[PDB]
Each structure stands twice: as structure tokens, then as C-alpha cells.
Amino acid sequence: DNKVKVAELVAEALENLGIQHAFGIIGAGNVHLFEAIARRGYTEIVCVHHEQAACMAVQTYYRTNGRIAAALLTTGAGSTNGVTGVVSAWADSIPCIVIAGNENSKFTFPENPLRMWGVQGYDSCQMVERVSKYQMRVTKMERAVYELEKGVHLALEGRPGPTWIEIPMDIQSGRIDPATLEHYVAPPAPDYLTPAVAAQVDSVLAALAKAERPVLWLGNGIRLAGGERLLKPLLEKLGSPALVSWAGIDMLDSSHPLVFGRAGVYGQRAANFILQNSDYVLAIGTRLAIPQIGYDLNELARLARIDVVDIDGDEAIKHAKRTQENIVCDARVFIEALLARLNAADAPAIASKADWVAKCRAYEEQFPWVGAEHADPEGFINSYRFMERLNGFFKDDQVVVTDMGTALLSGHQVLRFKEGQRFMTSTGLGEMGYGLPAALGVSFANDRGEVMCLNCDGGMMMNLQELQTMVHHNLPIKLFIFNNDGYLMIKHTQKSLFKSDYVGTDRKSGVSCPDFSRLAAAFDIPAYQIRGWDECDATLAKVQAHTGPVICEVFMHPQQLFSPKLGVVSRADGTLVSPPLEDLSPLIPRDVLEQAMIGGMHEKSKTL
Amino acid sequence: DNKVKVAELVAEALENLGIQHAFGIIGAGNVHLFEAIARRGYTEIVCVHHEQAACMAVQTYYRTNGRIAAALLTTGAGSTNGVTGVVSAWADSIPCIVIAGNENSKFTFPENPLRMWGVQGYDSCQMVERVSKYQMRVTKMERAVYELEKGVHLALEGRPGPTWIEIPMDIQSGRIDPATLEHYVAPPAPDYLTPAVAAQVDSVLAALAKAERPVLWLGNGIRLAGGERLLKPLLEKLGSPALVSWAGIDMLDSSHPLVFGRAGVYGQRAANFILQNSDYVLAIGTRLAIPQIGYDLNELARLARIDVVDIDGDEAIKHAKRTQENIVCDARVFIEALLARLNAADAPAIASKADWVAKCRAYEEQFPWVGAEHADPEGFINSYRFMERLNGFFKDDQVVVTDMGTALLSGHQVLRFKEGQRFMTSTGLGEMGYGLPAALGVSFANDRGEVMCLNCDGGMMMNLQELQTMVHHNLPIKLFIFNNDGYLMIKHTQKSLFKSDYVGTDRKSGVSCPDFSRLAAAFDIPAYQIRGWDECDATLAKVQAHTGPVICEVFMHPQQLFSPKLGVVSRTLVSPPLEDLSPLIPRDVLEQAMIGGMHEKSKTL
């Protein structure tokens, strides 16, 4: 009998693929895979308490060191519970693979006329068909490893994303001659630098050489491409200012002399002025999503040509009514091509941008990231000022992950990073409850390594159960929780729209959160509270010194503003106006704005 | 200006549809609907802490008093987080409506070439297309109320189930003259009693009149059809024993003289013998799912003709290789038609079933529900004996909901219900974490009424956050938690297959659970523990007397058997026939219990 269980061959393939961690929850639909993986001993299975946390954890796991991880899901609700995590990986271009069990394959076909398959199964592939790069149900034992290899390759290639491989129970427990196993051979990798694209790189260099006020806009596509180490020499060779997307913040020292922050609808004031007064914008590896560019392309960088580099052709041309060069190219290949052209025998002389760099520094001097608008409201800790203080306690290898709300906004508008530190969240889908699973993924990727998790009283509830995973494995997760009596982001939304009482956003209107320090004690997690500045520095130093898990609640004003922010504003008449991207709220005086805008202010700004 | 916000017309429509509760979480995608509903003051919005809980709570809400509820979801993860609840409602035929927000309608169409819609939207209708009865994206303001009326009708029509109506943000906030609203008019209900179906009813009645050992197998389709009050008159007019499906347990007093329990793979020994020794089985409103009939139709009730009544034609014929009459008909219509023929002046003569009824009582005498197999092991309370004791503390209008695991299995194999009491769980999908949201739904359906929630250390974790919802609204939910060091059901699965060390199922193999009494205190919930019999009755009384939420941890053996159970037995391996439940009885006892004598498979075990 020269046959081997398919499950054992799948466990071998995971080792051959370099997959050292799987996150998931057991059930009859994957018990044979749990068994095979556990007995081989190469892949560590991390048991989570909700499958959603497994499909989120794999994402930050990959982002930490570039090793893919698997989510191991069972039949029925084991699979439906993972869908939110699949969508966030899809939205943020993060590679991962889901291996989902199912009922016996005699039930698993879409022509089955019954509402459900077998005892409790369904078509888990169809459900993620539009939010994943590839789905396949293995119905032949001999193709089980083929489809895993293909799923991993397709997750990683091009614009990365999640893939979904479903293996019915009976396929897992079947036995075959290992010699009959089929294997997937990846097609040849594409050559992006075609003559057409090469000519676009020449055009970009000519524009950079002539531009007086260039701005590079650098995004996480660069890191996904493996090109972040090229950015420092690129920027210094060009003498050009750069902005970083929120997802790209950790690619370049925030204090590098040519890096000027983050622009958008929650932009920094100085960054938005730099963007909006440029004469040439080169976006590389950034999606130019709505929160980065606002709501009207004709109001974006009105004095500028805009070029865009993206490996996804649909993303590269979505702004084609506005952009000039839409460059469909891997970001690393593009930067290397541009650097080579800078050293060409016939390279153009690069005109000085010294006057513009000086103007960029003047904007930052005029508009600090933490300014008068971030005063402690009624004496409460202002979250923006808290982020600035926290920033100074970062370790040299600090990793920071965030949930949504205050953690997302104050974090990305304030925090500074240097080489060796990392910053991660889920901005594509923007789901509450990401922060804790995100911390799990980082910690396991770094062999139980330290992670700072910036979280919120609302978002803490969605995946609250993962506190048990964190304690079970004694993970050194430093979990800050911003308490502000509920859903502060939505309080502002409904107040702006209706100017009435809160609905469904605070304790009086239907939403309350527990005392997380009392919950911490129940889970055996040390806990601290920062209610004022008195205890802040000493508490932060203690939190950072902890070697295991720790919770720190931070108390802020329940109505604190998030600003700067591009918000709707009333004209003197009373008409509502959505102002141009440079005119962030709370609004600066019109005479200051006039002087900050090369051509004077936009017509919309004149009457606000 | 005679125009009105679409969101305000939606809030009016909800009132006109009788929807008094919505469960959900706010976001930009549904902020206009939250505002309109709250300002109107008819529909109470219950804010949950995970959208999955909202889509589960609406199910038990409906099942309590028959009023549909809505789930109110926002863009993006607001919608994806609901899908598990949608599938459970689909699998268990429970009507509910999801109202989901989305991005501006200029982004929301499948031909959009980008991975995501607008800021963070996706095609929420496509994602539930195979696990819901109807999905529609409202792209015209004048159709928003039409699609809600249509969605409620299609949820309740025929075989009930969830519907999914997506309303983009800009549609909610638009303004239209109310007289431009279109309205949905439901077609006339179908008439199931064609001549062909009437002839089928006459065939059933003729088989019942002649059968010496009939068994009616009654399922939740009867309650969904509104026919449960016809069952006592039917049973007594026929003199026939009945079994109830797990979902149908609460439709008839468990101690009614003609009700003999629940058969299946986790059957009661007596119920399985009654089923397996009948000469005629009439299934009404029960799916005859795999956990009910086992793994081989040729081994099911081998001496019996089997007829099936189901409103879903695919369900009615799925066993057609084995059944005789497959009747596509509403369960109430069918029962009314059968009673009309029974009460007719020309009604046929019903042969006596008195001997069979006596044989059913003897089966129950020889094989009690809680038996010697359920002894307390190694100093731990046995969960089956605990359920029997807990049963004695039920209130007169008790409602019980369960999670999976011990709560599901010990509960459905032991607990008895009287008229007025209710029993609910999710059996079609069988998802862990259903218990707490299920309890939320019942409590709000009964104006913050009392509910007993039988739960588990593993299942508690999936929707642990709803403990905050319970305390916020001070819901009198009585939450029992069976502590058994992790995933006991899977411990048995993997031990049966591999006979080695546990993997991913207990503290040492990767899965641990918190101290729920310490967690209770952190949430300001009073907490008790039951470890032995001495404190049991006093603690159960205290739990039942509390006016607000309570937690009661019950400690059981971490490897306690679940039984009786149709298990695989090593002779080579054999899956025995449904009557031959494990732990196995002696072959001579089985021989005597089987009117035919035992099956070939059983003789060698």
C-alpha cells in the first residue's frame, strides 16, 4: 500500500511553500488538515476565536516580513465568518490564501437544487467570487496540491490579493500514490518595461527635470513591489519633495528632509498646500483613492500635470480624465528604470527645485501637524497631542497597527516613523475590529514579537474575543484603547448632517462600551489608565517595558474634533459648499489662504 | 415644496409593514436611515456590537411571536459582517429582511471595473445571491418603498427566508413627492389543493386508516405555516404516535400521551426504535435532513411506507427513491384538508393503533432519555442529568435558546416543554455563537422578556461582545455556560478518527477560554458556578429569580461522552443502522427491540 492521505500531502506542500503559520478554527470540515499539519510540525496553527480574525491576521502577517500565511476554515459558518477579512485583503492588495473545508464532494456542486449542501455546507467559492483573485473547489484528489500552489502564486502575482481554495472533507481524507500528484508551473512573469512604457519613463524624467514644483506621491504598491529601499536615493537624486499615502507612511523616514507628510481629506494642512500648489505630481504605487484626492478631479493640483504608476491597469486609468501618463508597471521596475535613465548618457539636466523645497518647509513651519486647533478640550487629553507624546516612546523596531476611529485618524495625521519601524491598518475596507487581529498577525510573523495596537472603545468590541488568543500565547501586544463614549467619528457625521441629538453613537443614544481595565483584569492582562497628563509619561514608559500583553485606556473628550478635515461648509448666503482640497476645516482666515495659494484662492473659497 | 426624504418614507414603510424593531450598527452608509427611523419613533433600533448578531437576532425575534424584524447594515464590513446570520436564516427557513446601505449609486454597479465601489463598498447583493430568497439594489428613489414591501413579502412567502435590500446613500438622502412612490401588491396566495394534491391527501388518509404502526414526524414547517394548533386534534383523531424534529420540539407538549420524542443521529433510543419499527411514516413540515434520517435511505424505517409533505418542491422529492407520496403543499393547508376528510360524514374507519401505542410506551420504559449511560463521570456532573434537573426550574412561559455543543446536544436529547414554552436554535447552519444573539432577539420580541440561554465555553467567544448589549438594556437573559476545557464535540470527532492527542480543541492543544465569572463581574453581571449537586438547586433558583442578566458557569468532565449517538464502530469499520445507537446495547436486547429482528450490519458489532 504505497498511498498517502491527501491531507498529509497538503501539509507537506505548505512546508514546501514556506507557509509557517496558519490561522483558523477547527471543525469536521478541516479536522483532517488540522491533524496532518499538527503531526508534521512545520506550520504552526494559531487557533483564533472568530474566523474573521484569522482572515485579518494573515494580512499583517504577510506585511511584516513578506511571508504568506494561510487561513484554515471549516464548513458552513467557519467559511462565512471569514468573508470580512477576505474583503479587506482584496481592498488593500494583500496576498493570503484561505483553505476552506466543505461537505463531502457528492454534495458540492452548484446545480444542487437544495438550499444547502450536505449537512451545513454552501458554495463558499461563489460567495467570494467578486472579492478574491481566484477561487477553486478541489474535486480530484490528484489536484489538491496543484490548486494550493496555484492559489499561492495567484495571490502573490501582479496586484496581490486573497485566493480561496475549497477542499471537501472526502478529498482531504482520501489516499493516493504521491507520484500521481500534479503540480502547478507558474507562467513566465511579465515584462512590464515594454517600448511604450519605457517611453513613458522618459517622459516622466523630462517632466521631473523641467518641473519647478514637483511632488512625488508614494504608496504601498512600492513596498508590495519590494522597492522601498530605492526611495531615498531617488528623492535625493531628483531633489524633489515627496508625500506618502497613509498606507505608505513607513516607507521613508518621516523626518527625511524631502518628505513632507500626507495629503487628502484628512490631510495635513502643509501637505495639502504642497500638493495643491505643485506644477507636477508623480504618483507611484498609490491608489489615489477618494480620501486622498477628494471629490473633484478638476480641483486637484490645478497647476499641475499628474502622472500615475500602478501595476493594475484599471487603477492606473481610473482618473484618466485628469491624468497624463497612465503607467501600467510594477513600482520597483519603474523606479529602477527611472534611476537608470537618470544615469543615461543623454539624461536631461535637472533644474533646481531649491525655491520650492524652501516653500515646502515654510508651509510646515506655518502649519504644524499638531497645532492650536488640537488644544486639550475642556482639559481632556487631545488625541493628536497624545499621539505626539506617544511617538517619542517608540522602540527602534516599533511596529504599530491601528483600528479605525481616533486611532486611525489621529495616528496617521501625527505619527512619525524612521527606518526599522512599521505602520499598518486596513484602509481599503476600513473595518472596525481590525486592530487586534492585525496585532496577532504581526506578533506571530516576528516569532511572538512586540506590537503596539492603537484601538478604540467601539472597534475593540468587534473582535473582543481575541483578547483570549493574546493572553493564551502571552503575546507582547501593547493595546491602547481610546475611550470617548462611543462612536466619535459618526457623532461628527450625524451632527454635520442633522444638527440634532446623537442617534446610535453614544451611551444615551444606544451604544455603550465596557470598562476595559476591568475586562483586562478578568483576562489576567495588566492594565493602566491615562486620564490626564500627570501620569502619562510614567505610564507610557511602563507599558513599553512590559514583556507580555498589556492594556492602556486613554480618556479623551467625548466630542473632540477630528481635524484638519475636508468638510462641508456654509457660504455667507447659507448655501452648503464642499470646498477644494486645500481648504481644510476648521477654515483658516481667507487672507492667509490667499497668500498660501500661488494663483490666489479658488472661487469656492472666497465666500466661505 | 411637497417633497420628503426617501429615508423618512422608508421609516413610514417600516411602520406600515409592522416592523417594530431593527437591529444593526450605524455608519455613513445608513446614517440617514438611522436618523429617520429614530425620529419617527415607531421602530426601536437595537444597536449591537457586531452585525452578525443583528442578522441572527432577527431570526429568533420572528420565531417568538411571528413579527418580522429588520437588520440595518452599513457599507462595507457593515454588510460582510452580516452574512453568517443570513445563511443561518436561509438554512432554517426563517423570514427576515436586511436593509443594507452602500456608497453613492454612481459607483454601485457590477460593471464597475475596480476592486471596490466608491470608498469602501462592494456588491452586497451578489455576495448573498445563493443564500437568500431575493436581493435588490434600489437605484430609483421612487422604488425604495416598493422593494421593501416586496422584500418582506418574499421573505414570508412560500418557504420563508431572508431577503436583502441594498439602498445606496444618495438614494436615502434624496427627496421626492410621496405620491410618486410605487407600491408592491402581493399576488394571491397559491391554491395547493388541486385535484392531484387532493388525491394525494386521500391516499395519505387511507394509509393512516389501515396502518397498524404509524408515526407522524412533525417539523417546524408546521409552526411556520401557522398550523401548530391543529396538531392535538389531528393526533387524537388518528390515535397515532408522533415524533417531533429538533426544530419542532416546542410544537406539542413533550408529555402528550402520543408524543414520543425525537429521532435521528442524536436521537433518543426510544424514538429511534419507534421510527425504525413503524409501518407508515407521515412527515409534515420536516426537512428529513441527514441528522434526522442517517446516511442510507434503504435503512430508514425498513418496514414502512414513507410520505412527505413540504412546501418546497425540491425538499419534498429529494428522497423520492424511497418515499411514496411526495406532497408539495403548505403544512397548515394540508393538515386542514386531512382534518376535513377525517370529520366528514363519509370518513373512512380508522383501525386501532392501541397495541402500537402500548409498544411505544414500553420502548420509553425500557430506554429512558436520561439513563445509565449518563452517570456522573469521575466526580463531575453529567450534562444530561444537569439538563434534567434544570428542566424542573422552567417558568410557565419559559423560552430557551441554545448555542451548539453540549447545550445543543444535551438540551435537545433531554429537555421537555409544555404548551406556552419555546425552544430555538440554529440547526440548519449550526454556527457557534448563535446563542447570545438568539437571546437578544427573543427578549426584544417579548418587550425585554426573559430568556434562558444554554451556551458553551467555545461558542460564547464568537459573539462575546453582545454581553455589553445585554447589560446596556438590562435584559433578563439567564446565561448558562458549559465549561469543558474547549471544544468537546471536536475532541470526540478527532479521537474517533485518530485515537491520538487532541489538536486545536483544548488548552494544551491551542484553544482556551476565559473565566466567565470574572468576565461577568467586569461587565457588572452577577455570576454563579455549579460544580456539584449540593449547590445546584439553590443556584438554579437564584438564577431564575434574577430580574436582570445572569451568568451561571456549569463545570462538566472535559472528555464527557455525548450519547446516545449513531457512531462508527470497529467490527473493519461499520456505520450501523439508525436504531443501533452508541454505546451499543447487547445484541440480544436489540434483537428483541426490533419487530423484524436486527439488521445484518448489527449482528457483528
Ligand SMILES: Cc1cc2nc3c(=O)[nH]c(=O)nc-3n(C[C@H](O)[C@H](O)[C@H](O)COP(=O)(O)OP(=O)(O)OC[C@H]3O[C@@H](n4cnc5c(N)ncnc54)[C@H](O)[C@@H]3O)c2cc1C
Ligand atoms: C476615513 C479615511 C480617511 C483617509 N484619509 C486619508 C488621507 O487624508 N490621506 C491618505 O493618503 N490616505 C487616507 N486614507 C487612506 C486612503 O484612502 C487609502 O485607503 C490608502 O491608505 C492609500 O494608500 P496607498 O495608495 O498607499 O494604498 P492602496 O490603497 O492599497 O493602494 C496601493 C496601490 O498599489 C498598487 N500596487 C500593488 N502592488 C503593486 C506593485 N507591485 N507595483 C505597483 N503598484 C502596485 C495597487 O494596485 C493599488 O492601487 C483614508 C482612509 C480612510 C478610511
Ligand SMILES: Cc1cc2nc3c(=O)[nH]c(=O)nc-3n(C[C@H](O)[C@H](O)[C@H](O)COP(=O)(O)OP(=O)(O)OC[C@H]3O[C@@H](n4cnc5c(N)ncnc54)[C@H](O)[C@@H]3O)c2cc1C
Ligand atoms: C449535530 C446536529 C445533530 C442533530 N441531530 C438531530 C437529531 O438527532 N434529530 C433531529 O430531529 N434533528 C437533529 N438535528 C437538527 C436537524 O438536522 C435539522 O437541522 C432540523 O432541526 C430538523 O427540524 P425541521 O425539519 O423541523 O426543520 P427544518 O430543517 O428547518 O425544516 C423545515 C422544513 O419545513 C418546510 N417548510 C417551511 N415552511 C413550510 C410551510 N409553510 N409548509 C410546509 N412546509 C414548510 C421547509 O421547506 C423545510 O424543508 C441535528 C442538528 C445538528 C447540527
Ligand SMILES: Cc1ncc(C[n+]2csc(CCOP(=O)(O)OP(=O)(O)O)c2C)c(N)n1
Ligand atoms: C464593521 C463595521 N461596522 C460599522 C462601521 C461604520 N463605522 C465607521 S467609524 C464607526 C465608529 C467608530 O467608533 P470607535 O471605534 O469607538 O472610534 P472613534 O471614532 O470613537 O474613535 C463606525 C460604526 C465600520 N467601519 N465597520
Ligand SMILES: Cc1ncc(C[n+]2csc(CCOP(=O)(O)OP(=O)(O)O)c2C)c(N)n1
Ligand atoms: C463559526 C463556527 N466555527 C466552527 C465550527 C465547528 N464546530 C462545531 S462544534 C465546535 C466546538 C464547539 O465547542 P463548544 O462551543 O465549547 O462546545 P462543546 O462541544 O465543548 O460543548 C466547533 C469548533 C462551527 N460550528 N461554527
Ligand SMILES: [Mg+2]
Ligand atoms: Mg469611540
Ligand SMILES: [Mg+2]
Ligand atoms: Mg466546550
